[PDB]
Amino acid sequence: GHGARSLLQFLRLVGQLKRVPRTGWVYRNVQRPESVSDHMYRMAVMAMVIKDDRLNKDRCVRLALVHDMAECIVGDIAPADNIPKEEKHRREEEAMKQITQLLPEDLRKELYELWEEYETQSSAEAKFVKQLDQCEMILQASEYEDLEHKPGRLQDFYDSTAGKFNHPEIVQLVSELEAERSTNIAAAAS
């Protein structure tokens, strides 16, 4: 039963994503921060409910579910960790090779190529998912601010996404989030 054993080892590695807290929240003292799998779950849902008939939605959902999968080995590397982008890529690529080698060859190839597609940021689906990633993050940031009753506290996350959104539907979402958020901050400040 080497096949079943390998699959089980694969699913245990995947399960480690539940126990990897998202690093940016930890570094900002968020109580009970979300896991990497929480982050990917809402991104996948976003891909299902944001309309764009030019995009292959199935591909978008799968990219969302695979894009941070290397984190079960590498951990969630944050800008504050000061890891060179090429070193981060090397670590993540090596981790993805180790993870996918536990799968039958068709699925090994598929899962790896999906991760590669996201990393490459060429396809429209990959670029769309990158925007979902950033949108999900700033949405989560405002949710923590609200839960804490500390509006504006996580402003650094918003600043870091300046100019990064361009998809028509995502842009409407972010604008509505920012209008609500900025108005709340102004009211709290006065």
Q: Nearest-5° angle of CA 100, CA 101, CA 104? A: 90
The annotation status of 39 as a binding-site residue, yes or no, is yes
4 vs 190 by CB, closer to a copy of itself: 4
- 136 assigned ligand-binding residue: no
Q: Helices 168-189 and 124-148, interaxial angle, to 10°?
A: 20
Main-chain phi, psi angles of 35, to 5 degrees: -90, 170
Q: Does residue 76 belong to the site contacting Mg ion (CB under 5 A)?
A: yes
- Chain contacts with a copy of itself (rule: CB under 8 A): 1, 3-5, 7-8, 10-12, 14-15, 17-19, 32, 34-35, 37-38, 40-42, 44-46, 48-51, 58, 61-62, 65, 103-104, 107, 111, 139-140, 143, 172-173, 175-177, 180
Report d(CA 177, CA 171) in Å as an integer. Answer: 10
115-133 in b/e burial notation, b at 16+ Cβ within 10 A? bebbeeeebebbbbbbbbb
Helix (H) or strand (E) holding 59: helix 57-66
Q: Is the dihedral of CA 123, 124, 125, 127 positive or negative?
A: positive
Residue 53, annotated as binding a ligand = no
- What φ, ψ does residue 58 adopt, rounded to 5°? -60, -40
To the question of whether residue 133 is assigned a binding role by annotation, the answer is: yes
Given the rule CB under 5 A, which of 5-13, 116-124, 133-141, 176-184 is the region that contacts Mg ion?
133-141
Is residue 159 a known part of a binding site? no
Residue 2 known to bind ligand? no
Comparison of 65 and 151: residue with beta carbon closer to Mg ion: 65
List the single partner that 76 binds among Mg ion, a copy of itself, none, CB under 5 to 8 Å by kind. Answer: Mg ion
Euclidean distance between CA atoms 176 and 127, whole angstroms: 21
Give whichever of 45 and 83 is closer to a copy of itself, judged by the CB atom: 45
Give the phi and the psi of residue 151 in degrees, each rounded to 5.
-65, 135
Which partner in a copy of itself, Mg ion, none is near 32 (CB below 5 to 8 A by kind)? a copy of itself
Site string for Mg ion, 29-68 (x = CB under 5 A): ---------------------------------------x
Residues annotated within the binding site for a divalent metal cation are 39, 67-68, 71, 76-77, 133
Positions that interact with Mg ion (CB under 5 A): 68, 76, 133
